[PDB]
Enzyme design. Structure first.
Site: not given
Length: 352
Positions: A138-140
């Site tokens: 998951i890219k944050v």
């Protein structure tokens, strides 16, 4: 030639594709790439905006989803999660072959959550569960809230791609948050060996911001100098006794990932950023055209740690000129969030 990708692997760097689309996977192209040396995939809202607009295989999916009572965001998510899960399946053999160290696919949370740590944690947990694959990250965005969320997500055992880093200081803050999450898990007797985090440090945007007003000897040099110094910081942080105590227990180091590595100024060779940033325990995610260029006429050499003294001198001259790279980094992160939100709004409009 194509073998350059393997040559770079031998120098300790993975090369990922900075693109994703339904046809990329369905055509079998991604599977063939993952045999030819590509080791992973990254997406972001702009990548999906362009894929949804130009890839014919979305038309039937959109028509089907417009028959359901769904918000534009859930239509987008259903599409994007499906693409990511299919790509994860293509990359799984690679991922499992290395003990979970390669073969990742990244999906970014909604830009509107960037300053909301709790909301970011909630969406990231949900998207991790929705994709339902061990090789999804998951890219944050690496805002202060994103670094808060990173600690929580790591303590939850979730692999994360922390993005929109332009600052060495913020990157070090990310490492500290990661280590806190890892330490929590170890204290609780939970596994850590499958948790992987990358720190996506952006390259071309720095040179795009500064070059027009820099002196000759500095044009096209700042982004590489900043990355080289970031990598030196990385070596120092992760070899220190504090992290060594965690790595001894199975923790993985965070790895720097060079992003925005397509060259945006025609005054520079198209392989400049890939050629210049190769070093051990890193990733470089490249758009299709840059991957093409690197295969055709790139060079595989361990350049990232070369001439660190010159990188330091260049950053000292940047400061001498009054360019505060920390102020710049905050602006570039802000601007990137605005741009990603613009792209996201553009892709949602046809899904209403």
């Amino acid at each position: 030639g194509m073998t350059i990708l393997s040559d770079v692997k031998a120098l300790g760097q993975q090369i990922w594709l900075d693109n994703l689309s339904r046809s990329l996977v369905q055509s079998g192209e991604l599977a063939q790439m993952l045999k030819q040396g590509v080791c992973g995939v990254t997406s972001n809202p702009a990548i999906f905006q362009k894929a949804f607009a130009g890839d014919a295989l979305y038309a039937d999916e959109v028509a089907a989803l417009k028959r359901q009572n769904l918000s534009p965001k859930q239509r987008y998510e259903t599409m994007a999660v499906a693409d990511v899960r299919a790509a994860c399946d293509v990359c799984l053999a690679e991922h499992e072959s290395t003990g979970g160290k390669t073969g990742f696919v990244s999906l970014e949370v909604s830009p509107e959550l960037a300053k909301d740590a709790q909301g970011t944690v909630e969406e990231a947990r949900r998207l991790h569960a929705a994709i339902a694959r061990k090789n999804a990250m998951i890219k944050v965005p690496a805002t202060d809230a994103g670094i808060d969320a990173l600690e929580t997500l790591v303590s939850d055992g979730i692999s994360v791609n922390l993005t929109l880093l332009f600052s060495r200081a913020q990157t070090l803050k990310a490492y500290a948050a990661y280590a806190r999450g890892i330490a929590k898990r170890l204290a609780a007797g939970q596994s850590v060996a499958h948790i992987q985090v990358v720190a996506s440090f952006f390259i071309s945007r720095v040179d795009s911001a500064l070059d027009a007003t820099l002196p000759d000897r500095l044009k096209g040099k700042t982004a590489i100098a900043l990355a080289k110094a970031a990598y030196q910081d990385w070596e120092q942080y992760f070899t220190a006794p504090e992290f060594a105590a965690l790595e001894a227990q199975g923790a993985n180091r965070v790895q720097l990932l060079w992003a925005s590595t397509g060259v945006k100024n025609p005054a520079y060779p198209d392989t400049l950023y890939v050629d210049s940033l190769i070093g051990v325990h890193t990733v470089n995610t490249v758009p299709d055209a840059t991957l093409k260029a690197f295969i055709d006429h790139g060079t595989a050499k361990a350049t990232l740690t070369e001439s660190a003294d010159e990188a330091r001198a260049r950053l000292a001259e940047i400061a001498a000129l009054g360019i505060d790279v920390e102020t710049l980094a905050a602006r570039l992160q802000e601007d990137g969030l605005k741009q990603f939100e613009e792209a996201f709004e553009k892709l949602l409009a046809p899904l209403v």
